[PDB]
Design a protein around this nucleic acid. Structure first.
Ligand SMILES: [K+]
Ligand SMILES: [K+]
Ligand SMILES: [K+]
Ligand SMILES: [K+]
Ligand SMILES: [K+]
Ligand SMILES: [K+]
Ligand SMILES: [K+]
Ligand SMILES: [K+]
Ligand SMILES: [K+]
Ligand SMILES: [Mg+2]
Ligand SMILES: [Mg+2]
Ligand SMILES: [Mg+2]
Ligand SMILES: [Mg+2]
Ligand SMILES: [Mg+2]
Ligand SMILES: [Mg+2]
Ligand SMILES: [Mg+2]
Ligand SMILES: [Mg+2]
Ligand SMILES: [Mg+2]
Ligand SMILES: [Mg+2]
Ligand SMILES: [Mg+2]
Ligand SMILES: [Mg+2]
Ligand SMILES: [Mg+2]
Ligand SMILES: [Mg+2]
Ligand SMILES: [Mg+2]
Lengths: 155, 121, 205, 79, 129, 70, 78
RNA sequence: UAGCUAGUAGGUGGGGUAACGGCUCACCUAGGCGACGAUCCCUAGCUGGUCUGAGAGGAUGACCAGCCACACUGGAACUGAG
RNA sequence: CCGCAGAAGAAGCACCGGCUAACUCCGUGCCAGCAGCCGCGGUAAUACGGAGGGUGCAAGCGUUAAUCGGAAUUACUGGGCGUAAAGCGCACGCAGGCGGUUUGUUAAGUCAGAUGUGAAAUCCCCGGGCUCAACCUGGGAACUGCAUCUGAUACUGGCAAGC
C-alpha cells in the first residue's frame, strides 16, 4: 500500500494549569489500483498521531471502479462545507488537483484527472468529499446491471 | 436570484478601486517634499520610521516611505515615488525610489543594491 | 545563456549522475555525489511536493543543457502536440542536434557536442548547421565536416560512446563519422529515472 | 479605376507579394476587392514562387481592370 | 399553484425512490406517459399503467437493485421559468453516456442517444442517471 | 554600523495615551517622546514630572525615545 | 415578398398607423426566452386599419421622417 | 435623470435634391416618443481582433487591416465626377 | 562563404522564516531596520546589516503600474437569506413572469436540411521558406452569427372547440 501524510495540526485544550497541546494527523492510504482509505489520528506527539492515522486508514479502505487510471464519468462530492468536482482526463494530463484531493487520487491510483475544490478547503472535509465522490462513481457494468441491459445497450 | 430577476437587473460587478490612487495608473510619479519627518508605527512594532509628505506633479499630496538606512532628503527635495504600502504606517501607500532624482542611494549596501539604488562596487 | 559553472555541483544537487563529465572516470571518484553541494549539504531535509516537482524539472534541464525560457517553450510545444505531453517533451529534447551529436558519440559530453555544433563542425544532410537547438528529423544524416574529422576529441568521444548503451533509434558509422537519425525515440527507449509527469504538473500550476 | 497589382507583405528584405484586384486609389496594402494569386520573388528552387488565377484575372480584365507592369510580366512568365 | 406537471412527476419518482415505495401514482398526461415510456424502455422503471377515463391516473412501478434505487438522480432541465433547447450536435451526454437525457424532438419524446441517431435536436426535458 | 542618536535629559510635562509623552528637554525644546521597548517590557512607569533621558534623531527634532527614567 | 406581421397600436395619424411586431428572443446571458417589441410607423393609404387589427406589412422607400413600411393587408379585423 | 416633443407626428400642395424624405415652406389634422428606459447627465471613436480564462465570462481597442470623425477655434460656401 | 590569430573581447540580478526552491557565522539589541500577507527585531536573529554558502532566473534580473486569473468573492455555466450580510410589518392588486387536461389547427418559439453571407490579417491544423527559432508563407479548418428558402410538429406560444 502507498501511504501519504496530508496535514498535521497542533490542537489545544485549556485546563486549570494552562493548555494541554496535542497533535492531529490526516493520512490517506491506497493500493494504487482502486482501493483507498483515509484515517485521522490524535496523540500527544506527531509520530504517534501519524501511526494512529495510518492504522485507521488501512482498515477504512473503500473500493473505486477506475477506467485505466482515470474516472468513469464526472463526479461531484460534498462533505460539510467542502464541495469537490472531478472528471476523467486523457493520458498524460496528470493529476490536476489541489492539495488534499491530489493525495487521495494519487494513492487511489488515478493518474489522469481534472479536479476542482469549491467552498471550504479544510483537508479533513476535502478528503471526505473526494472519497465520497469516488465511491458514488459508477462503472458501465454496474449501470448495465441495475438497468437490466448489456454494456453495449447502455454504451 | 431568479432568472427573471437577473433579466430585470443583471449581476453588478464590484468596482474595485486602486490602492495607489495618487499614481493615477502610472508606475512612478515625481514630487516635491513638503515635509520630511519620522513616525511611530502601529501597535505591535516600534521604531522611528523615516517618511516624507510629497506634493506630486498631478497635485496629490501624499506620504511616502523612505526605505534603507539613512537618507539625504530635505524640504524641497525632488523625488520619485512608486507604489508600495507600509503595513505598520497608517496612510503610507507609496515608497520613495532610492537612487532616482534628488534621493540618494543607500550608503555601503552590498545586497539588494538595485532596490536601494546602489552601483556595483 | 549557457551554464558555465561547475558541473558536479549540479549532479550532486540532483543526487544522480547527469552525465556532465565524459565518464572515463567514475563520478564518485571526482566528487561526493551522495552529498548535496555547499556547507549545509550533508544535511538531507524533507523536500516538499513543489520541491520534488522542481528538482525533477531541473534534472531534465541540466542533463540536456537548456535554460528555462527555451525549456518552457519545449513544454508548450509538447502540450500542443497530440499524444502524451510528457513523452512529447522528452522527444523534443532528444531531437536537439547537440543531443543527437552526443548520442551518436561525436562529443564526449553534451557540452562538447554543443561546441562542435556551434563551431561549424556538424552537417545535417550535407549542410552546415551551428544551432544546438536544431530539431533533427527522421532519416536525417548527421555528419562531421572534413576539417573536423581530424579533431582528436572526436576520435576519443566515439570510444566513450562504445562503452555506453547504444541508441536503437540512431545508426552511427565510426569510420565515416556520420549517423542516421532513423526515428524519434519512444518513451521506452529513454531512461525510467525521469518522472516527466512531475514537469507536466509543475507547469500545470 | 480597378487595377490588378502587388500588395507587399513578407518581412524586411524578404518581400512576398499578394496579387490583388483593387480600386487604384486605395493604399497598396489596404482595401482590396479580391486576391487572385501571389508572387514570391525570393522563392526557393523547388517552391512555387508564382501562382495566378488567370481565369479570375481574365474576368476582371473583361470588366475593364488595368494590370500593373509587374503583374503583366508575371502573367507572361506563367504563360 | 401547480405550474410544472413534469417536475412534479420527476419529484414523485425521486421521493418515491428515497422512501422505498413499490409504486408511485399521479394525474396522467400524454407527455407524462411519453416520458414514462422512455424510462421503462431504458430500464429506470419496471413498468407503468394508466387507469381511469375522465380523470386518468398514471402508476409507475419503481425498480430497486440490491436494495438500492436504480434512479440515482433525476433532474428537471427545461422548466417553465427557463426553457432549454439544444441542436443535435449540442445534445447533453449525462454521466458520460451512462445516464440519459429525455429529449422532446419533432419525432416524439426520446433519449439523447436516439435523438442523435435520428439527427434531431429538441427540448431537454430531464436528466436521469 | 547604524547612525548615532542624540541623548538628552528632559522633564515629562504631560502624559498622553498609549505610553506617549510631551518632554521638555535640556535645550528647552518640547518633543513628543514614546517609551522604549525595554522599559515597556520591564514595566518602568513614567509620570508627569519624571526626569527622563531621551534619545533624539537628527531626522526629526520633534520626536524621541525615552530610554531611561531617573 | 418579405413581410412582417404585427398588431395595430395606433390609428390617430392620417394615412398612417403604428404597428407592433412582437419577437420571441433567447436572452443572451440567462437563456430565458423574452418578448421583444419593434414598433414601426406604417403607411395606410385608405385608413382601413383600426387599433387591435393584425396587419401584414412590407418594407418600402421612405414616405415620411419615420415611415418606411407600407400596409400589405389586414390579416384579422379587431 | 420620469416624463419628453411644435417641423414636433402625420397628411395635402408648392419648392428643393443626383436621389427617397419635414429636406424646406404654407395650410390641415393632433399627433409622435417613453419603465422593452424616452428625455437629461457623465464617459467613450466602432469593428476585425488583443490580453486573460478550462469554459462561460471579464478587461481592452497600441501596432496591422475595414469603417467613421477631425485638420488653430467658430461659421460659410466656391470649384469639381467627387 | 573562405582564410587568419588567439581563450583570446563578452555575467549579472533577485532570493534563501512560512506561503516558496535555497542556512550558517558575525554585527546590532523592539534600535537601526525588514515586510506582499502572517509577521521579524526587547542579547546567542536561518526574518534586520555585512560575510561565506546555497537556490532561482540569465543578457538580463528585480521593483512599480495596469488587466484577467486564482475569486463559486455578482455564482448564466456556478452562491446565498432561522442564528454568520440577507424575507418588505402585513395584505390587496395593475403592468409583467408563469400556467391543469383533451382534440383539431397554425407553425411564432424550437428542430432539420439547403442557399447566400460572415473582408484579409489574426487564432487553430497539415505543409513550405529563411542554417534553427522568432518571423514569413501555401492550403484547410474556424468565424459559435445573421438572413432566406424548404421541411419536421413532440414540447412552448397563437387560434378554435372541449373537459
Ligand atoms: K515588533
Ligand atoms: K499533448
Ligand atoms: K423637420
Ligand atoms: K409633405
Ligand atoms: K470584444
Ligand atoms: K472642428
Ligand atoms: K475633376
Ligand atoms: K445561479
Ligand atoms: K403546437
Ligand atoms: Mg535569451
Ligand atoms: Mg430614417
Ligand atoms: Mg474622446
Ligand atoms: Mg474561472
Ligand atoms: Mg457637383
Ligand atoms: Mg546575534
Ligand atoms: Mg468570476
Ligand atoms: Mg456566500
Ligand atoms: Mg446579530
Ligand atoms: Mg443576520
Ligand atoms: Mg415577514
Ligand atoms: Mg399547458
Ligand atoms: Mg418556425
Ligand atoms: Mg477572416
Ligand atoms: Mg397547443
Amino acid at each position: 500500500l502507498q501511504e501519504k501524510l496530508i496535514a498535521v495540526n497542533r490542537v489545544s485544550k485549556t485546563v486549570k494549569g494552562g493548555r494541554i497541546f496535542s497533535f492531529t494527523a490526516l493520512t490517506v492510504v491506497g493500493d494504487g489500483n482502486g482501493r483507498v482509505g483515509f484515517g485521522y489520528g490524535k496523540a500527544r506527539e506527531v509520530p504517534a498521531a501519524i501511526q494512529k492515522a495510518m492504522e485507521k486508514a488501512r482498515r477504512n479502505m473503500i473500493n473505486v471502479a477506475l477506467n485505466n487510471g482515470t474516472l468513469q464519468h464526472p463526479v461531484k462530492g460534498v462533505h460539510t462545507g467542502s464541495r469537490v468536482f472531478m472528471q476523467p482526463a486523457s493520458e498524460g494530463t496528470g493529476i490536476i488537483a489541489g492539495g488534499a484531493m491530489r493525495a487521495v487520487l494519487e494513492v487511489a491510483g488515478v493518474h489522469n484527472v481534472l479536479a476542482k475544490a469549491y467552498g471550504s478547503t479544510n483537508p479533513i472535509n476535502v478528503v471526505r468529499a473526494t472519497i465520497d465522490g469516488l465511491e458514488n462513481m459508477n462503472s458501465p457494468e454496474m449501470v448495465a446491471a441495475k438497468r437490466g441491459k448489456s454494456v453495449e445497450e447502455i454504451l | 436570484a431568479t432568472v427573471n430577476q437577473l433579466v430585470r437587473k443583471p449581476r453588478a460587478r464590484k468596482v474595485a478601486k486602486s490602492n495607489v490612487p495618487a499614481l493615477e495608473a502610472c508606475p512612478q510619479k515625481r514630487g516635491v517634499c513638503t515635509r520630511v519627518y519620522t513616525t511611530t508605527p502601529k501597535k505591535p512594532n516600534s521604531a522611528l520610521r523615516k517618511v516624507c509628505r510629497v506634493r506630486l506633479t498631478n497635485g496629490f499630496e501624499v506620504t511616502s516611505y523612505i526605505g534603507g538606512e539613512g537618507h539625504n532628503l530635505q524640504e524641497h527635495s525632488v523625488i520619485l515615488i512608486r507604489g508600495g504600502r507600509v503595513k505598520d504606517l497608517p496612510g503610507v501607500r507609496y515608497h520613495t525610489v532610492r537612487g532616482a532624482l534628488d534621493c540618494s542611494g543607500v550608503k555601503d549596501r552590498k545586497q539588494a543594491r538595485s532596490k536601494y539604488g546602489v552601483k556595483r562596487p | 545563456a549557457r551554464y558555465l559553472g561547475p558541473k558536479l555541483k549540479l549532479s550532486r544537487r540532483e543526487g544522480t549522475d547527469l552525465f556532465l563529465k565524459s565518464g572515463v572516470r567514475a563520478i564518485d571518484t571526482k566528487c561526493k555525489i551522495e552529498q548535496a553541494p555547499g556547507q549545509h549539504g550533508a544535511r538531507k531535509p524533507r523536500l516538499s511536493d513543489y520541491g520534488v516537482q522542481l528538482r525533477e524539472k531541473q534534472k531534465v534541464r541540466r542533463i540536456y543543457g537548456v535554460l528555462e525560457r527555451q525549456f518552457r517553450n519545449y513544454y508548450k510545444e509538447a502540450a500542443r502536440l497530440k499524444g502524451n505531453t510528457g513523452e512529447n517533451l522528452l522527444a523534443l529534447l532528444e531531437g536537439r542536434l547537440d543531443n543527437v551529436v552526443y548520442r551518436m558519440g561525436f562529443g564526449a559530453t553534451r557540452a562538447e557536442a554543443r561546441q562542435l555544433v556551434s563551431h561549424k563542425a556538424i552537417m545535417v544532410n550535407g549542410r552546415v548547421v551551428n544551432i544546438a537547438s536544431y530539431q533533427v528529423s527522421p532519416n536525417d544524416v548527421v555528419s562531421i565536416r572534413e576539417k573536423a574529422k581530424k579533431q582528436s576529441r572526436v576520435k576519443a568521444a566515439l570510444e566513450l560512446a562504445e562503452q555506453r548503451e547504444k541508441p536503437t533509434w540512431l545508426e552511427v558509422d565510426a569510420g565515416k563519422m556520420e549517423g542516421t537519425f532513423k526515428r524519434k525515440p519512444e518513451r521506452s527507449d529513454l531512461s525510467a529515472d525521469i518522472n516527466e509527469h512531475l514537469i507536466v504538473e509543475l507547469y500545470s500550476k | 479605376m480597378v487595377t490588378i497589382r502587388l500588395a507587399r507583405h513578407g518581412a524586411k528584405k524578404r518581400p512576398f507579394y499578394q496579387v490583388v484586384v483593387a480600386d487604384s486609389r486605395n493604399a497598396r496594402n489596404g482595401r482590396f476587392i479580391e486576391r487572385v494569386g501571389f508572387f514570391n520573388p525570393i522563392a526557393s528552387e523547388k517552391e512555387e514562387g508564382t501562382r495566378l488565377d488567370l481565369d479570375r484575372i481574365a474576368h476582371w480584365v473583361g470588366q475593364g481592370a488595368t494590370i500593373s507592369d509587374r503583374v503583366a510580366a508575371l502573367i507572361k512568365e506563367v504563360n | 399553484s401547480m405550474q410544472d406537471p413534469i417536475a412534479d412527476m420527476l419529484t414523485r419518482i425521486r421521493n418515491g425512490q428515497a422512501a422505498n415505495k413499490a409504486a408511485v401514482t399521479m394525474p396522467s398526461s400524454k407527455l407524462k406517459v411519453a416520458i414514462a415510456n422512455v424510462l421503462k424502455e431504458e430500464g429506470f422503471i419496471e413498468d407503468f399503467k394508466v387507469e381511469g377515463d375522465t380523470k386518468p391516473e398514471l402508476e409507475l412501478t419503481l425498480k430497486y437493485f440490491q436494495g438500492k434505487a436504480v434512479v440515482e438522480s433525476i433532474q428537471r432541465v427545461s422548466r417553465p421559468g427557463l426553457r432549454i433547447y439544444k441542436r443535435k450536435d449540442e445534445l447533453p451526454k449525462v454521466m458520460a453516456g451512462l445516464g440519459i437525457a429525455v429529449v422532446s424532438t419533432s419525432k416524439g419524446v426520446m433519449t439523447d442517444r436516439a435523438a442523435r441517431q435520428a439527427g434531431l435536436g429538441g427540448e431537454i426535458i430531464c436528466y436521469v442517471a | 554600523a547604524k547612525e548615532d542618536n542624540i541623548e538628552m535629559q528632559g522633564t515629562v510635562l504631560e502624559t498622553l495615551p498609549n505610553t506617549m509623552f510631551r518632554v521638555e528637554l535640556e535645550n528647552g525644546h518640547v518633543v513628543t517622546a514614546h517609551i522604549s521597548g525595554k522599559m515597556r517590557k520591564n514595566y518602568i512607569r513614567i509620570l508627569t514630572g519624571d526626569k527622563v533621558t531621551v534619545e533624539l534623531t537628527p531626522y526629526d527634532l520633534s520626536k524621541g525615545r525615552i530610554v531611561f527614567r531617573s | 415578398i418579405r413581410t412582417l406581421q404585427g398588431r395595430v397600436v395606433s390609428d390617430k395619424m392620417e394615412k398612417s398607423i403604428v404597428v407592433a411586431i412582437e419577437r420571441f428572443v433567447k436572452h443572451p446571458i440567462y437563456g430565458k426566452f423574452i418578448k421583444r417589441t419593434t414598433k414601426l410607423h406604417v403607411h395606410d393609404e385608405n385608413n382601413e386599419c383600426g387599433i387591435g387589427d393584425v396587419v401584414e406589412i412590407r418594407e418600402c422607400r421612405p414616405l415620411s421622417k419615420t415611415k418606411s413600411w407600407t400596409l400589405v393587408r389586414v390579416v384579422e379585423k379587431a
